[PDB]
Amino acid sequence: PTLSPEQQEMLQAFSTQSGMNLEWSQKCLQDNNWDYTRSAQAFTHLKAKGEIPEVAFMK
């Protein structure tokens, strides 16, 4: 339900970089072990395929 200080900073960074809202950014990071490099790769892979749900990019 809540994030550590370090996770909070990672979340804000990833939301900005990916363009996803905070909740979907948190989902991507959690799905990838709070590993930013891995999360970014995973995101980029799915984005290119057109498979990320459009709700992920809404405010």
Partner: peptide, 9 residues
């Protein structure tokens, strides 16, 4: 583990 997930896990 239903629904959308990111990365290879």
């Amino acid at each position: 583990d239903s629904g959308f997930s990111f990365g290879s896990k």
